[PDB]
Amino acid sequence: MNDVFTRAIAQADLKGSFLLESDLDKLASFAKEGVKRLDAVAALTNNAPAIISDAAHKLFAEQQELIQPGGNAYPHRRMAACLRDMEIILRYVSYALLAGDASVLDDRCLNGLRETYNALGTPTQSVARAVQLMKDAAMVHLKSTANVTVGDCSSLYSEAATYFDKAAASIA
Amino acid sequence: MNDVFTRAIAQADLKGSFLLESDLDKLASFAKEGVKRLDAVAALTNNAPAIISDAAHKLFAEQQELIQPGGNAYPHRRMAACLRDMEIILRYVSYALLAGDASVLDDRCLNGLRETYNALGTPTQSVARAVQLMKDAAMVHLKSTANVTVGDCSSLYSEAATYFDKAAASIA
Amino acid sequence: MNDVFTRAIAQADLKGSFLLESDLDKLASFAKEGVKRLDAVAALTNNAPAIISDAAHKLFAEQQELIQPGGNAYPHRRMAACLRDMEIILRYVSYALLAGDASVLDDRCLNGLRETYNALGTPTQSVARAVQLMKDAAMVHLKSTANVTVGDCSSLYSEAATYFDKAAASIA
Amino acid sequence: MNDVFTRAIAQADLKGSFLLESDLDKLASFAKEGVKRLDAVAALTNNAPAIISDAAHKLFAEQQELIQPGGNAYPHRRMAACLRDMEIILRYVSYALLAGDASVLDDRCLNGLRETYNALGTPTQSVARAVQLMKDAAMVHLKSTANVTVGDCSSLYSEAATYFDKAAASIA
Amino acid sequence: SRTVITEVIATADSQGRFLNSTELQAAFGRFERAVPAIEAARALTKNQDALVKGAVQAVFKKFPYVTQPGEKGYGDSNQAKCARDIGYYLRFITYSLVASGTGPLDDYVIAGLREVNRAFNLNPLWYIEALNYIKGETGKLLSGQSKTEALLYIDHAINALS
Amino acid sequence: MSRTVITEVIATADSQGRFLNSTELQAAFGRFERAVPAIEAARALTKNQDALVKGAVQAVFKKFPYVTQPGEKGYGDSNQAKCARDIGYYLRFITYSLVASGTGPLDDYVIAGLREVNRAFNLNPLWYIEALNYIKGETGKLLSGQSKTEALLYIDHAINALS
Amino acid sequence: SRTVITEVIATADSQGRFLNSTELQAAFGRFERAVPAIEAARALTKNQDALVKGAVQAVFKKFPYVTQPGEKGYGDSNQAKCARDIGYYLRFITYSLVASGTGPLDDYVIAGLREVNRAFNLNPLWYIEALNYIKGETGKLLSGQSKTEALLYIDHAINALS
Amino acid sequence: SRTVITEVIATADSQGRFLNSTELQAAFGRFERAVPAIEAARALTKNQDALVKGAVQAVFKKFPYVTQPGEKGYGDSNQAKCARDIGYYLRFITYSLVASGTGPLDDYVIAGLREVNRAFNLNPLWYIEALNYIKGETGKLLSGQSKTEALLYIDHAINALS
Amino acid sequence: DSLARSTMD
Amino acid sequence: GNTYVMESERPATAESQLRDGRITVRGFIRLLAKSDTYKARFFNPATQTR
Amino acid sequence: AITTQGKRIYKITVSEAGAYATNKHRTGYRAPIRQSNYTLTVPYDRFLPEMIRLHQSGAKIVNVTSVIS
Ligand SMILES: CCC1=C(C)/C(=C/C2=NC(=C\c3[nH]c(/C=C4/NC(=O)[C@H](C)[C@H]4CC)c(C)c3CCC(=O)O)/C(CCC(=O)O)=C2C)NC1=O
Ligand SMILES: CCC1=C(C)/C(=C/C2=NC(=C\c3[nH]c(/C=C4/NC(=O)[C@H](C)[C@H]4CC)c(C)c3CCC(=O)O)/C(CCC(=O)O)=C2C)NC1=O
Ligand SMILES: CCC1=C(C)/C(=C/C2=NC(=C\c3[nH]c(/C=C4\NC(=O)[C@H](C)[C@H]4CC)c(C)c3CCC(=O)O)/C(CCC(=O)O)=C2C)NC1=O
Ligand SMILES: CCC1=C(C)/C(=C/C2=NC(=C\c3[nH]c(/C=C4\NC(=O)[C@H](C)[C@H]4CC)c(C)c3CCC(=O)O)/C(CCC(=O)O)=C2C)NC1=O
Ligand SMILES: CCC1=C(C)/C(=C/C2=NC(=C\c3[nH]c(/C=C4\NC(=O)[C@H](C)[C@H]4CC)c(C)c3CCC(=O)O)/C(CCC(=O)O)=C2C)NC1=O
Ligand SMILES: CCC1=C(C)/C(=C/C2=NC(=C\c3[nH]c(/C=C4\NC(=O)[C@H](C)[C@H]4CC)c(C)c3CCC(=O)O)/C(CCC(=O)O)=C2C)NC1=O
Ligand SMILES: CCC1=C(C)/C(=C/C2=NC(=C\c3[nH]c(/C=C4\NC(=O)[C@H](C)[C@H]4CC)c(C)c3CCC(=O)O)/C(CCC(=O)O)=C2C)NC1=O
Ligand SMILES: CCC1=C(C)/C(=C/C2=NC(=C\c3[nH]c(/C=C4\NC(=O)[C@H](C)[C@H]4CC)c(C)c3CCC(=O)O)/C(CCC(=O)O)=C2C)NC1=O
Ligand SMILES: CCC1=C(C)/C(=C/C2=NC(=C\c3[nH]c(/C=C4\NC(=O)[C@H](C)[C@H]4CC)c(C)c3CCC(=O)O)/C(CCC(=O)O)=C2C)NC1=O
Ligand SMILES: CCC1=C(C)/C(=C/C2=NC(=C\c3[nH]c(/C=C4\NC(=O)[C@H](C)[C@H]4CC)c(C)c3CCC(=O)O)/C(CCC(=O)O)=C2C)NC1=O
Ligand SMILES: CCC1=C(C)/C(=C/C2=NC(=C\c3[nH]c(/C=C4\NC(=O)[C@H](C)[C@H]4CC)c(C)c3CCC(=O)O)/C(CCC(=O)O)=C2C)NC1=O
Ligand SMILES: CCC1=C(C)/C(=C/C2=NC(=C\c3[nH]c(/C=C4\NC(=O)[C@H](C)[C@H]4CC)c(C)c3CCC(=O)O)/C(CCC(=O)O)=C2C)NC1=O
Ligand SMILES: CCC1=C(C)/C(=C/C2=NC(=C\c3[nH]c(/C=C4\NC(=O)[C@H](C)[C@H]4CC)c(C)c3CCC(=O)O)/C(CCC(=O)O)=C2C)NC1=O
């Protein structure tokens, strides 16, 4: 639920003292580059159908055990649930990127997803591989600079990749 | 949904000035007479199923056509509705008796009951005749001073009579 | 909410007698004709996409003012409601056709749709002529004898035409 | 539930022509006055409680009967409802001022209030007096330029006056 | 009025999709059932009065203790319109036979049953033994499938009274 | 959790807090009696599966010529294997729905969530619509009597779902 | 047609309270964002007919099979429908730019799209390619904040189509 | 808490849909308004002690009788608690300015304050006077955008108190 | 966990 | 779920309209669930299955 | 709801018809008996489930009036 600003305010309350001028400057710098982050998440959302299409195609090209009967994503309903699963994973990664903090992704997708899939019998490593493929497609799509001013967004690329890293580590 | 005390306090606040001693005296006198009316209501409640049974027997006695096919009481569940209506109307009579006010009867049921039985098309004169049947049987059991001290319930008998009459007038 | 058999049953109840010999013969014949009308309504359900597509195409071809700006079928949601009204109205007509009693058709939304469209401002004559389109398309589709044996259907067509006329009259 | 730009877009859609550069210029003129209009709305908002308290005190001043027995506000609950109804009416008028339209104010608050006061018997004259006092205190607090840059807000005052007048007319 | 096609229509109209193959086949089965049931109803109506009266004496025989002065039906009129009530139930059995469903029974007689019995101090076991005699005779009159639906409908009626 | 006539009956009875009345027994009898033509049709379709699938492949090819050229989605040997596999599974589930006397198998297996699969794989239903069109054209002679229409009902429902 | 103002006031009405820093800030930011979207709407209004024709030929170009006889797209009245429909789409895009929110596009077209599209067998890819042409031409039309507004709104319409 | 970006994330979660240009515009405007709000936070932080002392003595000036023995104000511990409460309020107002919303302030003071008020007889008017003094004091400590936004935050707090 | 066991038998 | 709701959080307009009775208690429950506090307590910190 | 097409709430007057009451008796009195006629205000979006549910319940719509437009 909490973003970087909320998290900083939470620590300030925990110590009970006002926000430090240094941390206020850090938040000012974060807000200054906020336009770049908004551009990054917009690039995420327009390419999100493309990212998921690419990730699904490459995953199904490398793994075939699911398309056959007895696969965890064999029936149309099951694999459709799989597709929306990756969709929602990417959506929550984007939400964390907006927030700059992983608290919201933890609250939504990383509190109890593991045992949920264990009960469903879902293999988590397949989900982690799908996360990796979406991460690759997303870094490809955001490292492009179509119709937007060029600039150093390596920090945003690193942050998004690391958010995918926490998501993958959570699931598997 | 009022009582005698509610209406008295209502008019007392209507004049704005405090309660006047004469009204308080009438209320106290009623309170002294209270237990008589209480026992009357209790006896009515005890005899209610027998009241309904005998009144239904009479209703068939003077009117047979309802039992015959096509009568509004001819189907089993329709005459069952008839019986529970006898129940509810005499129960509202009991409510009026215990409260002593008429609006608790009027506002709570009669206003909607009007359109209810107008839409249902049931002849309301037969309904009021049945109400008179309950009036007779209820007075038969109420006049019964079995297993209780003997006293002057003539005013209460008059009040019960007026309640049956006004219920019949409202329904018919 | 009474079938044609239930219609006859209620009639015999209101006469307070058993069902007639001739009534039994007619109802047994209707049961014999039940297979034919089951086939007819099965075709109606199967031909429903074709019927709605043809009817909508004809309607929009001969009524473009529904499609001009601000038209009753312009906002792409008003015409969507028109399409859903088409499918649900032919659904009710099929209900009546298989049922054999127009009473269920009259009770299901035929009592409310007239003032509904009066309040919405939609001209009900367009609705009625769209119902005529339903009639034409559905009759044409049901005329097909493919993969089924040949037999009498004239009585069923007459009954369906009467049901369509009743629906049009109730609408407008 | 619309604002003025929604109004213009609705007419543009129903004619189906494009929003003219003259229409664009007018709505842009509204937009550049929007910054000032939001300050007017904030003046209504932040000053709402004191405005309401002063107006209600005045209502009690000119109308001594309403607190006295037989007054429409004589029960504590009734003058409480007076307070909250004036608060919600001023809130909806502020909604109208910020949206720059009458639809937002008239769709919900000013749609069933007149019927409510008519059926209940509330004197609409007193409510109109309350609304005009709301307007007077609103002007008193909107002319306050304390801690804000001075400028001409005549359009805002006129539009808020129209909103208050139309709200009173709908109530009356 | 819950004939099988009636809840077919209700189920179809509840959600958005039309009739699919399952209820079409169910209606096919109903139209198949409708004939032998109709000869069942015809043959049953052929034998109304003898059946009702015989069931009436059967009711007396199985419960002699009630038949004493003090009987609820004691007296010619009471037992006569008892036989009238039995004929009414037979009427509604015939109606259900026509509808091939518990529509008439459930709608008319079963609704409000226990409440009325408590109201009028009527033992359903009288009715139950009457329908037992109905079993006994209909074991001969109706045969084959028609016999089966008739028996099952009377069984449903008994379970309602039970 | 399939929905077949007897299973639907059981679910309805459990929901209402009651036992099985006459209608449920009659419906069970109808399903049991109709199972024989359905089983006949299932076996007959089982005999000639290869002809059906191959004819479906060539019918899909002939109907839309713009596909099997290189550079688009349908071109490819793996694509051909996937076409054959998809048509095979389609006829598998159609036979399953024939045997169940209900569309529940088809619904749950494929019709549940099919649309998002299509839009995530660019698969307009029209190819499989034409495939099933050829399928019913072929089965117009494969079966006889009741089995023909028993197949027809479920395949038509599947096509309508594909629409 | 929906405006940020409209959603703000609807939420305020649901919560039944006055407006704090956040609602005023959103209102402001929409007012400053109003004029570049207005200019983008004008810059798309000037090239309405050229954009419509270019989109029509782009549809005829990208997918070869839309032009041949016997095809749904083929047809003189059909082509008039194409032009009128593209005009509807881009005009409501201009409306959304005017309102400074996606809501106008959302309700006016996006609501009820897919089921209507398969009601008459309409290819979403056709409208996707038409709006791809719209993107290509509007990219050279506009620069700056107006460019961002127009491109984001047309691409939102695409995402609705996709 | 409830920051603009937080509530945008939450609402985007609600309809099960990604973000769009409108909410990104809201976040944009939040980012630009942060800088004057950041300067407001600096000015308030550097002045916190004088702010608290001035507010306490202003409340004392308005209601000196509270300081009389036997009342809440009397007592050095009582005055220390007054100052500590006003300092907490000022810190939460700084958090409000930083967060570009009422989220932290709402959650951490406004949630469940009137309960304590009624229980401990802590008149809101005292903190209202303190915040009014802080308003007058920041009228000179701040100017332009920062003064206006800090004023609206603190008067939001005042209106919540009353 | 409890919901999981009801999926199969 | 026995979570104590702060007295400030509750909606006055909805309860007033329920008091007049124009809205059923079902509608008031709808308004309660739609209120953001429901999500903040329930939807926001908890997974969707939970 | 918020949408211009979501607005235009319409009021509905509902009569608990005789068929509705007969169905209610068989289903069971799991709701208190109220007078057959009652009014109701329904937004546009949930306008449909109202008369749909009244149709499965057996009741019929007395009339329709519009709060907005
Ligand atoms: C908010 C956090 C959260 C999310 C988003 C979530 C998704 C999710 N996936 C589910 C099941 C599922 N999940 C998958 C995904 C699998 N398919 C493939 O084989 C892979 C191994 C893998 C994806 C790469 C499948 C196939 C199911 C259906 C299980 C079944 O029917 O057998 C379910 C329960 C049943 C259902 O919805 O149909 C949920 C809620 N769960 C959560 O707690
Ligand atoms: C539950 C049973 C089941 C079904 C119904 C099924 C259909 C199916 N086919 C798929 C891929 C495919 N299917 C086809 C077949 C196409 N070739 C063209 O000629 C036609 C339009 C069409 C067949 C006539 C192709 C070419 C792909 C590859 C799509 C891609 O990866 O880009 C996929 C996506 C999985 C993947 O990419 O590996 C599914 C779910 N699969 C199943 O396990
Ligand atoms: C509706 C939401 C929204 C968007 C989409 C938006 C785009 C946007 N990006 C901007 C700057 C920028 N945008 C980016 C980000 C892009 N450049 C990098 O190469 C990356 C490929 C990519 C992000 C991953 C950068 C690096 C800048 C330059 C920073 C600056 O101008 O201050 C600007 C300022 C233009 C100016 O100062 O003249 C805008 C308006 N603005 C908005 O309010
Ligand atoms: C809320 C308070 C309340 C009232 C006002 C009330 C009266 C009442 N009687 C009703 C039906 C009925 N009322 C009767 C009784 C009449 N027909 C004949 O039998 C008699 C001559 C006569 C009675 C003496 C019958 C037969 C019905 C059923 C009509 C039908 O099922 O079609 C109904 C319709 C709803 C229902 O049956 O549940 C109401 C509301 N019951 C209540 O609980
Ligand atoms: C469990 C609830 C409860 C009940 C119901 C109850 C009945 C009751 N009613 C009483 C008063 C009375 N109530 C009655 C009325 C009765 N006599 C006739 O008029 C009527 C047939 C009938 C009323 C309709 C009478 C005569 C008295 C005695 C008053 C006296 O002392 O003169 C008394 C006190 C007798 C006395 O002190 O003289 C009792 C115990 N007590 C209870 O604790
Ligand atoms: C129980 C079954 C049922 C029916 C029959 C029904 C009719 C119905 N149609 C409506 C709207 C509509 N219906 C139509 C369709 C009509 N106008 C077009 O020109 C066509 C010629 C014609 C098709 C019959 C249109 C255009 C609207 C939109 C009216 C508006 O936006 O205000 C509405 C208002 C709410 C909505 O659906 O959007 C109702 C209640 N509602 C139901 O629950
Ligand atoms: C579960 C739904 C259902 C199905 C699947 C069904 C198929 C079906 N319909 C039949 C009767 C029939 N079916 C038709 C077909 C009609 N002839 C006209 O040309 C029309 C185009 C066409 C449809 C109206 C005919 C003529 C009969 C024989 C009429 C009769 O004997 O009653 C028969 C028996 C014919 C035989 O075995 O020789 C079957 C198997 N019937 C159903 O009720
Ligand atoms: C039947 C319901 C009802 C009640 C309960 C009632 C009492 C009552 N008296 C009031 C006015 C007042 N009440 C007081 C008395 C208080 N102030 C001090 O002087 C005293 C220590 C204290 C008395 C114990 C005063 C001074 C006012 C005038 C408020 C003003 O300055 O406007 C008010 C508020 C209206 C206003 O602001 O003028 C109420 C509700 N009137 C009613 O119709
Ligand atoms: C749809 C949005 C909405 C509106 C429009 C609204 C106002 C509203 N005003 C009402 C009547 C009322 N209006 C008033 C106020 C008047 N009477 C006196 O106090 C003053 C002279 C005067 C105010 C200046 C009062 C007291 C009532 C209720 C009367 C009573 O209960 O006896 C009622 C019905 C009874 C109640 O207050 O619960 C409502 C719902 N509430 C809403 O949720
Ligand atoms: C709608 C379906 C229906 C049922 C269920 C029905 C039974 C029924 N039994 C009744 C009373 C009665 N019922 C009986 C018969 C019983 N007592 C004897 O001992 C018999 C052995 C026994 C029968 C098994 C008698 C004798 C009465 C007379 C009591 C009275 O008149 O109140 C009544 C009251 C009115 C009347 O019929 O005269 C009904 C309606 N009639 C119907 O039309
Ligand atoms: C204002 C909201 C609105 C939309 C969104 C809209 C699209 C639309 N186009 C239609 C007909 C049509 N539309 C087209 C054109 C399509 N095929 C290709 O050529 C083009 C790429 C593409 C259009 C850009 C054609 C050929 C038809 C003929 C009917 C058919 O076969 O579907 C229809 C069915 C009835 C009609 O309007 O004529 C709709 C709803 N119409 C509207 O009133
Ligand atoms: C959400 C954050 C936000 C707020 C609070 C806001 C209000 C605001 N209005 C301004 C200009 C102004 N504000 C007003 C309105 C005021 N002046 C008149 O005297 C009236 C008394 C009163 C209206 C009630 C006027 C007339 C101007 C100058 C006109 C212009 O905008 O150029 C300014 C620029 C001066 C400054 O730095 O303080 C701000 C900040 N703008 C924002 O972005
Ligand atoms: C059935 C009767 C009942 C019990 C048993 C009960 C215990 C209880 N305590 C709660 C929270 C709490 N309870 C306390 C009280 C304790 N913590 C402090 O340290 C003190 C030492 C101590 C009080 C003297 C506190 C401070 C919280 C706040 C924690 C939170 O909700 O975040 C909650 C969560 C309620 C909510 O906010 O939605 C419950 C249910 N509540 C009840 O209605």
Numbering used by the authors:
A (entry chain k), B (entry chain g), C (entry chain h), D (entry chain i): 1 to 172
E (entry chain a), G (entry chain c), H (entry chain d): 2 to 163
F (entry chain b): 1 to 163
I (entry chain 5): 740 to 748
J (entry chain 5): 592 to 641
K (entry chain m): 10 to 78
What does the paper say about this structure?
Here we show the cryo-EM structure at a global resolution of 2.9 Å of the 5.9-MDa PBS from Anthocerotibacter panamensis (hereafter A. panamensis), a recently discovered Gloeobacterial species that diverged from Gloeobacter spp. around 1.4 billion years ago. The A. panamensis PBS features a configuration comprising two herein characterized linkers and presents a paddle-shaped morphology. The two-fold symmetric PBS contains twelve APC hexamers assembled as a heptacylindrical core surrounded by twelve PC hexamers, with approximate dimensions of 273 Å (width), 500 Å (height), and 129 Å (thickness).
In contrast to the tightly stacked rod cylinders in hemidiscoidal PBS assembled by CpcC, PC hexamers linked by CpcN form loosely staggered disks attaching on the side like a chain. Phylogenetically, CpcN is distantly related to CpcC but is close to CpcJ. However, the CpcN in A. panamensis has five pfam00427 domains but no CpcD-like domain. The attachment of CpcD to each pfam00427 domain of CpcN likely inhibits the formation of rod cylinders because CpcD acts as a rod-capping linker that terminates rod elongation in hemidiscoidal PBS. Although negative-staining EM and two-dimensional (2D) averages from cryo-EM indicated that the four distal PC hexamers in the top two chains (Rt4/Rt4’ and Rt5/Rt5’) exist, these four PC hexamers are too dynamic to reveal a defined density map for reliable atomic model building. Therefore, the Rt4/Rt4’ and Rt5/Rt5’ were omitted in the reconstructed PBS structure. In contrast, the staggered-packed PC chains only exhibit a preferable inner-chain EET pathway with a longer bilin distance from Rt2’ to Rt1’ (37.0 Å), compared to 24.3 Å in a rod. In contrast, the two pairs of transition dipole moments exhibit relatively parallel orientations in the PC rod, as indicated by the value of κ2 being close to 1. This finding suggests that the efficiency of EET between donor and acceptor bilins in the PC chain is lower compared to PC rods, even when accounting for both the distances and orientations between them.
